[PDB]
Protein: Transthyretin
Organism: Homo sapiens
Amino acid sequence: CPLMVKVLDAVRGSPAINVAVHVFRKAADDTWEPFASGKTSESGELHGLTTEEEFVEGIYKVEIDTKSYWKALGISPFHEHAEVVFTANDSGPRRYTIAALLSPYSYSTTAVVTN
Amino acid sequence: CPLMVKVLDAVRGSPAINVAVHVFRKAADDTWEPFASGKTSESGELHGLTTEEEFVEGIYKVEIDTKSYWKALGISPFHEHAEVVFTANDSGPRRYTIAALLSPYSYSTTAVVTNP
Amino acid sequence: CPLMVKVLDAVRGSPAINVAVHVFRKAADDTWEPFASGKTSESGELHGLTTEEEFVEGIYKVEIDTKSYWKALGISPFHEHAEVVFTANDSGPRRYTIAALLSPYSYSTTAVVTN
Amino acid sequence: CPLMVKVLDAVRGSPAINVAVHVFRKAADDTWEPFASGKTSESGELHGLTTEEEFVEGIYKVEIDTKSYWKALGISPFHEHAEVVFTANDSGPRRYTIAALLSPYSYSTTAVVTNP
């Protein structure tokens, strides 16, 4: 589990369930190439995105499809998606958790990088 | 200018208007003494809380009444009020802006501190 | 586990470890009375604060001693503590997690209330 | 006035000054076309990005170069840049303020949208 994503809903105070998440890796020609994807669980978590073998150093983008989440709940959103762009560095610790807290016109994100 | 409060609404994408804000100062007997209060303008801002002379050093609590705000908007909130507790002016006068961003089950607050 | 607290550090991207947390309940004379307390674990979590028996409806305050956390790391903080004040309502779901994300001059908090 | 960006620093309690901001607009071929760019002032604000005439409807991305900011300050950051993607002006012109609050391993962004 080198990479995990956790998504929370600030309107209802709950995990954000069945949210699509796409991860991309920056290629040498500076295009974004698909890397991993999935949908959040009942707990707002998405596990099993990648393996240690596949998750090499580089620049990654995590796109969380927030507009589809809100629209389906009957709530008008502002963003198309939430995006988190970061460099994976082997020097530091080994497990990355990208967390996002969603509101219709705002979001917060953090990374927790542990060993 | 010594103390400003600015409140935004993350559900509607707007200033949070007519929000009640109370400021307290910790007294020597460790109780919270009322200091100043006001309600936010149409821009989500509250100025005129205090003057430099009245705003002495100590421990201040800024209580923003988020629950009344969300109830007026027709939305069920979790928190009773967002609170921000800080020591002010302990190395001389500063200008403080306390900003809050509100959602029904969450808030985010920051401070900008400047030296006149 | 009706009440859990989780604290994260936005400067280092890590759990906030050994942070003191005090919980109070509003008494009938509108004073705050001590209810529970503890220190966050290596994972930034504080479990076992209360039992279902003790955690009745009412107004609660969670005080997280952030100033002591930062000062010990050699980083100058703004707040005395982070405070979260909320009503526990039996109507809604049964487990409350209060999460806080700390920075030296800012913090974010959310509640996740699940069944 | 149609597009403003405002950036704050949660480590120092200050505006984030001289932060580079790039705006892109999604083209018909689904690539991101440069639209406007600037750097934040001493108040953490960036105005003058566009005019009402130039700011047509579509999908915009506001990329705030947080990594250069933290590196200048001497602090190790996680993110490459904070990104905010949104559809603008699809029901006529609006005024958008995009605010971001930065920490080394986290950021929080909101929007205030007003109808002139």
About this structure: Chain D touches chain C through 13 residues (CB under 8 Å). The first helix of chain D runs from residue 66 to 73.
